Amino acid sequence: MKKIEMIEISQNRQNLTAFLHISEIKAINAKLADGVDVDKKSFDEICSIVLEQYQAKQISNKQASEIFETLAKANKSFKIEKFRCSHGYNEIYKYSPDHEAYLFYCKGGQGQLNKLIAENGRFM
Amino acid sequence: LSTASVLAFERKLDPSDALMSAGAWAQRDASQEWPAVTVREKSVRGTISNRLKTKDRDPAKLDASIQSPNLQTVDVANLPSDADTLKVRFTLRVLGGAGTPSACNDAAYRDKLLQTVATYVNEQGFAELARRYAHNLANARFLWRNRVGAEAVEVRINHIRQGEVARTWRFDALAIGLRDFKADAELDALAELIASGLSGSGHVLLEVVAFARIGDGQEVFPSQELILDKGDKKGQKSKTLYSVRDAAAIHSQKIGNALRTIDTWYPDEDGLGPIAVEPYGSVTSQGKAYRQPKQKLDFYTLLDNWVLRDEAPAVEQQHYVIANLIRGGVFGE
Amino acid sequence: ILSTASVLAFERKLDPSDALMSAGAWAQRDASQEWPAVTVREKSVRGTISNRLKTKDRDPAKLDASIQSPNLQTVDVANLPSDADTLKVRFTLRVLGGAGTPSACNDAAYRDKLLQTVATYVNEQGFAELARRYAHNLANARFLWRNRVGAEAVEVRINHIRQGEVARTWRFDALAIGLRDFKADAELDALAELIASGLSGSGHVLLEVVAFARIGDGQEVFPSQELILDKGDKKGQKSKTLYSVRDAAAIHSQKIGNALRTIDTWYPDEDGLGPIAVEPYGSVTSQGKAYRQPKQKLDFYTLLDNWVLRDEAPAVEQQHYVIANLIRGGVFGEA
């Protein structure tokens, strides 16, 4: 599993507390380093310290792949992306929460989508 | 060889706006002078019933938000008090020439795409897909919510050759199922006609008329429209319905979805009813995605595994790929 | 595992119609196929000001100057004719069946668990009690909301029309069976078994229910009333509009649907008011309070979450309430 994929899994999911069931923390606290114990911690804090221990090279790559995939399957709640493009149809829809749907915004490919993402922010 | 940067198919199954009128059962043969189902505008008063998120779940805040009601003014469609059946009429034309793209970048890609589609067609034609489309026409699925709780649905499918009706079919839509695709002695002529239309031989235009015996003065459900509800007054329009020239109707793509609800080859469970042929075959009701692209069973994987790598899928999945070509869109980028 | 669904929605499962009004004479009510409709006329109304006054606006001369110029209104009125004492209010109610399957659900385990919950409910105790309460609300003409109070002899008749023609009919006197006490009669049990057979899915039932009220000769009947647009020629608008389908006074279908589901006597107080309508956070807009608050453990959402997620089924009365407002319908989800 790639490395920026773990960064995007850290970045995109909702910040939850008490989402880790007993088997996950039972594997995790013995699986990760001896530094931090993660009890009642937010998703961003756990993912940031695991990505930092992956950056400052102390733990291997396959362990980080397993624990980031475990943090992926343990979370089902996603943040809303505010901007969804139709690729072949060359369109860009924008999320409107009162409709709970993506209303039409502008004609544009991926570069216009990245421009709008840099302007308005990538998430809701 | 890669896929083309542009490749787009027209829809080869074109219905009109299924417009609805009202009348009395057992006089439904002389039913070309029935009055339309007009969309009236009534006023509702809703109350709080959404889930509170334990921030306004206080004894005083809920009692203060109960006393302030939610006044709205919604459109509504109903049969008249002397009419107890709903007649929904549209025309469906089957174009044909399925796997021929309408705007293709590459020639070496589209020639072998036409070769794979032609190998499918002369190997096993559109008879399975036309059987399933004729089942979604005979079983009146295009009455979406005007079919639940109905007493007796009856579908009349003409075949308008040159203005003159050349061939007639009459189905009891509740006798034949909505799940099991069993063969009937009369339905096979309609399936043969749709197969002849899709295969190129002839011009097929049917006139589909569905009578659903709802009840005297009951409610019919036409297609609903989009509202940009920025701000509301005392009572502001919160729901509007579709109407072609002051007469309620279902949208042409909602009675098109109920025509291509033929996909029962998806890997999850073929016993939980057919779904709509879509890439990453999805239902917004169930909120999930059959044919997940983590599996190798979506449309956008089987397509370039069939055209590029020449890995011909299962016989029951080539029907899905060709049915998604009949649906249309731009594939490949 | 097993968090709640992100969205949930259930269909209506008890579909009434806009009950049209007609007017005739009693003892001619066995014909009642030619009775002319109650038409909604407009009448002008003069009224002095009568609102409560703050302690600063209690000048004598100011009040004398305010009552010198009146409020002129152009309200609607729906009267019976001056030669017709009986009001006939008719509609059709069809029951669909399949009260457990949602119309939208983001979860897949939760949908199958909720379906298992509803199915083991219907196997444990069927739709007998809920249909007996719905048949009592059809029996005593509660859907006549203000045309029932002060009436002389209300009489309801319900015909099971199955193939265009009637199958069998019920005739009740709606004043012997009151609003509060569920009496469980014989014909009430027959109508209860029929509505329960329609609710469980055993068949398709479409009742035609007609209620006659001997309200008096030339009196005022009360159809449900609409609201105002407030746009274009605002001064001199119609101060009160009434519902009318085709120039025929009618009650809104959701008002009759509210009157049929006034069944639950299982809320915390359950003594003073009587039965209220089934609703999440069980509330009445008139009394202005929520009888099933989330602070108490007798809500709908708390009960449904405890029943499905935690597998702790409540008492059979509260299970009747949860299944009854699944029979009601609606959108259960965060908004």
- Hey, where are the domains in chain B? 1-10+98-125+262-333, 11-97+126-261
B154 touches B211 (CB < 8 A):
yes
Angle, in degrees to the nearest 10, between helices C109-124 and C301-308: 90
H-helix segments, C25-127: 60-66, 109-124
Angle, in degrees to the nearest 10, between helices B299-306 and B315-327: 110
B326 touches B10 (CB < 8 A):
no
Angle, in degrees to the nearest 10, between helices C316-328 and C301-308: 110
* Distance of alpha carbon B219 from alpha carbon B10, whole angstroms: 36
Q: How many CB atoms lie within 10 A of CB C206?
A: 23
| Contact residues, chain B, for C208 at CB < 8 Å | 216
Tokens of B4: 């083309």
C104 touches C269 (CB < 8 A):
no
Give the chains touching A; criterion: ≥3 Cβ pairs < 8 Å. Answer: B
Can you say how many angstroms the Cα of residue C83 is from the centroid of all Cα atoms in its chain? 30
Are B66 and C290 in contact (CB < 8 Å)? yes
Q: Which helix (H) or strand (E) holds C316?
A: helix C316-328
* Distance of alpha carbon C329 from alpha carbon C104, whole angstroms: 12
Residue C19, φ and ψ in degrees, nearest 5: -80, 110
What is the distance in angstroms between the Cα of B103 and the nearest Cα belonging to chain A?
12
* Pairs of residues, one from chain B and one from chain C, whose beta carbons lie less than 8 Å apart: 126
Are B330 and A88 in contact (CB < 8 Å)? yes
Of C230, C279, C289, the CB nearest to B234: C230
DSSP codes of every residue in chain A = --SHHHHHHHHHB---SS---HHHHHHHHHHS-SS---SS--HHHHHHHHHHHHHTT-S-HHHHHHHHHHHHHT---B---SEEEETTTTEEEEEETTTTEEEEEE---HHHHHHHHHHH-S--
Are B329 and A87 in contact (CB < 8 Å)? no
Buried-exposed string C120-142: b where 16+ CB fall within 10 A, e elsewhere:
ebbeeeebebbbbbbbbbbbbbb
Are C288 and B67 in contact (CB < 8 Å)? yes
Give the chains touching C; criterion: ≥3 Cβ pairs < 8 Å. Answer: B
Resolution in A: 3.4
Q: Which residue has the tokens 């308008």?
A: B160
Residue C151, φ and ψ in degrees, nearest 5: -75, 160
* Distance of alpha carbon C48 from alpha carbon C70, whole angstroms: 5
What is the distance in angstroms between the Cα of B82 and the nearest Cα belonging to chain C?
11
For an interface test with B, give the residue of A89, A93, A96, A100 to mutate (most B CBs within 10 A): A89
Are C11 and B48 in contact (CB < 8 Å)? no
DSSP codes of every residue in B149-163 = T-S-EEEEE--BSSS
* Distance of alpha carbon B166 from alpha carbon B170, whole angstroms: 14
Tokens of C133: 């309460």
Are A89 and B330 in contact (CB < 8 Å)? yes
